[PDB]
Amino acid sequence: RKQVSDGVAHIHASFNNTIVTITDRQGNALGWATAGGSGFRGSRKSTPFAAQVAAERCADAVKEYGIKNLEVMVKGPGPGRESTIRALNAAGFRITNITDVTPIPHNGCRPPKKRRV
Amino acid sequence: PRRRVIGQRKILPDPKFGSELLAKFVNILMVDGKKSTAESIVYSALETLAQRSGKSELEAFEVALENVRPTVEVKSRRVGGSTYQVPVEVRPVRRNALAMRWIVEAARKRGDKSMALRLANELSDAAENKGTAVKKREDVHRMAEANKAFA
Amino acid sequence: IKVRENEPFDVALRRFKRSCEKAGVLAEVRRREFYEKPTTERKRAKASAVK
RNA sequence: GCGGCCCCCUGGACGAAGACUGACGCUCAGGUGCGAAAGCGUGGGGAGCAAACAGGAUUAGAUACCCUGGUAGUCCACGCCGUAAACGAUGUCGACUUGGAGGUUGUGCCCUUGAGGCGUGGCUUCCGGAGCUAACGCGUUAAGUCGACCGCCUGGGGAGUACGGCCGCAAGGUUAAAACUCAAAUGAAUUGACGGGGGCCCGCACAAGCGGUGGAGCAUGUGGUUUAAUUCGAUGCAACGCG
Ligand SMILES: [Mg+2]
Ligand SMILES: [Mg+2]
Ligand SMILES: [Mg+2]
Ligand SMILES: [Mg+2]
Ligand SMILES: [Mg+2]
Ligand SMILES: [Mg+2]
Ligand SMILES: [Mg+2]
Ligand SMILES: [Mg+2]
Ligand SMILES: [Mg+2]
Ligand SMILES: [Mg+2]
Ligand SMILES: [Mg+2]
Ligand SMILES: [Mg+2]
Ligand SMILES: [Mg+2]
Ligand SMILES: [Mg+2]
Ligand SMILES: [Mg+2]
Ligand SMILES: [Mg+2]
Ligand SMILES: [Mg+2]
Ligand SMILES: [Mg+2]
Ligand SMILES: [Mg+2]
């Protein structure tokens, strides 16, 4: 439809769920998928396998997309932070740079208290 | 066991046919310790299957056993929480024995005429893939690939 | 943070990310509530490290 | 008690020799000052976090642990409060007493070749000798040998409570009893046992399989009940086809 011919995939991976969204360099989202929405409701959605399933499910259908080269950037503590890439790269888009954001707060915003369980 | 390695001797090959697998099949099919009845029943079913399918005698059952053997099995595992169905790799001999047990129990649950014909029917429907052994066989395949990270 | 791999990368094997801290800083920072804890997390193992 | 960086004001400590005063010192009841966090008053600010509070879970119950929100508070200025396991559970000052390995910060001599040799101070961590100690342990930074002064203790509970005095806006703080009751309370260490502590190992313990019991009929024993009597024993595993 637009034939971007290049893009970047933002992965937000946490201990609870994984989200993957394809986007343009100018911050324009085309599609997204989540392990929770990929039929892994419960404890499996936090597993690496459900992350790669969502990655490939979001990467599929490249015809209308048109993104040939798809960079990658991950954020947060994921289920290895590598399985999603292992699936996405084989999905068809070659990877040349992966950046990791993982926002590290330089102090401030006192974290929540501890869990006594 | 827990400390000493074990291993069982190999049963005698099946009479006349010389099929070690057939000799093991009569062992599994044996009930109350009567090899005569098991041998008669297995031979009756084998000849019935051969004449019904038009196939040879040795490999007619081999095809069905090949087509009713699984690849992975779920083992109940719970490291930190509740039970997790963790699929595992099946050993060769374990695969063979499991398929054999599946065939025998599937023939057991039938009610066609008698063991001689029920075993032949099970072999035929296993060759075709429309029996009950195959119906139970696809379950492990569908339940595989659940929890890899756990061990 | 960034990978600049040579033209031959095989199947895109991550060799430099693995050698880097990977999750050094990530694991260091993902913890919480650094107020009453540090006063007591202190060496004393270094002491046990002896012949 | 104090951690981004920069500026202004300002206190203390340590090293080099040199000069100067000439016991001017140590300790300190009462007194004065400082003093975490929480808390209080007035006026601001309020992103995150979070007492109270609300809801959802778990549970026999849960006004708790868990989850979703969330006010005071946490922040700032000026005042008050004066309490902490405010601990090194070890008052300050001075002298003497074998060593070893480190850290941090000065300084002297030298073939100075070097991220080197040889010395001399301040602070600081660990291990250990004599000695001391109930023991654990301390050990030149003493809990060793001595000297000066101060503070405090006299069985456990009642009780750091009551009354009185002083202080505070309040919460409360400080000083501080008696009646009554018990024969103990307590410290260190030893052996064993136990732990929803850790490590290693074994058993048909689990797992992988076969066959069972618990369902039906019957045999037998036991409990219970009834009976003239239903003789007496045996009772988790280790009594119940047992004597
Ligand atoms: Mg949370
Ligand atoms: Mg005084
Ligand atoms: Mg305060
Ligand atoms: Mg206030
Ligand atoms: Mg206010
Ligand atoms: Mg809460
Ligand atoms: Mg006090
Ligand atoms: Mg303190
Ligand atoms: Mg302390
Ligand atoms: Mg004291
Ligand atoms: Mg010592
Ligand atoms: Mg009082
Ligand atoms: Mg009073
Ligand atoms: Mg045995
Ligand atoms: Mg078992
Ligand atoms: Mg019965
Ligand atoms: Mg008697
Ligand atoms: Mg009796
Ligand atoms: Mg008796």
Side-chain angles (χ1 to χ4, degrees), chain C residues 29-43:
Chain C
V29 173
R30 57 101 175 278
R31 24 71 154 171
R32 316 272 76 83
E33 201 64 8
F34 199 71
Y35 294 138
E36 299 191 357
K37 177 170 63 178
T39 178
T40 39
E41 305 183 299
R42 10 142 333 288
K43 203 220 118 121

Side-chain angles (χ1 to χ4, degrees), chain B residues 13-123:
Chain B
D14 153 42
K16 197 173 179 65
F17 302 80
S19 176
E20 285 82 320
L21 198 296
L22 198 293
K24 180 54 151 191
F25 186 96
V26 300
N27 288 104
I28 283 85
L29 183 135
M30 186 190 330
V31 175
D32 250 345
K34 300 186 177 181
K35 271 230 201 175
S36 60
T37 304
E39 213 215 5
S40 62
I41 293 298
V42 65
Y43 293 157
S44 179
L46 163 151
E47 59 88 16
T48 301
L49 190 286
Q51 294 327 57
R52 183 185 302 177
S53 65
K55 199 41 51 194
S56 71
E57 285 293 8
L58 197 286
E59 56 104 44
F61 102 105
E62 194 301 317
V63 175
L65 279 192
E66 192 279 340
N67 200 191
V68 302
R69 67 179 66 269
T71 289
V72 292
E73 293 75 5
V74 305
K75 302 256 148 219
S76 177
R77 180 96 57 200
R78 71 223 264 174
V79 175
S82 305
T83 35
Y84 313 100
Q85 285 65 356
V86 180
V88 280
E89 169 293 359
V90 81
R91 310 189 304 277
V93 283
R94 178 53 200 279
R95 206 201 276 95
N96 184 309
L98 184 35
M100 193 168 350
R101 294 164 51 84
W102 282 355
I103 288 322
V104 173
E105 57 83 15
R108 200 81 83 261
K109 310 315 142 190
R110 294 176 67 89
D112 196 329
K113 181 46 56 182
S114 169
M115 266 288 138
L117 192 80
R118 295 172 187 180
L119 215 165
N121 305 333
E122 273 316 84
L123 272 275

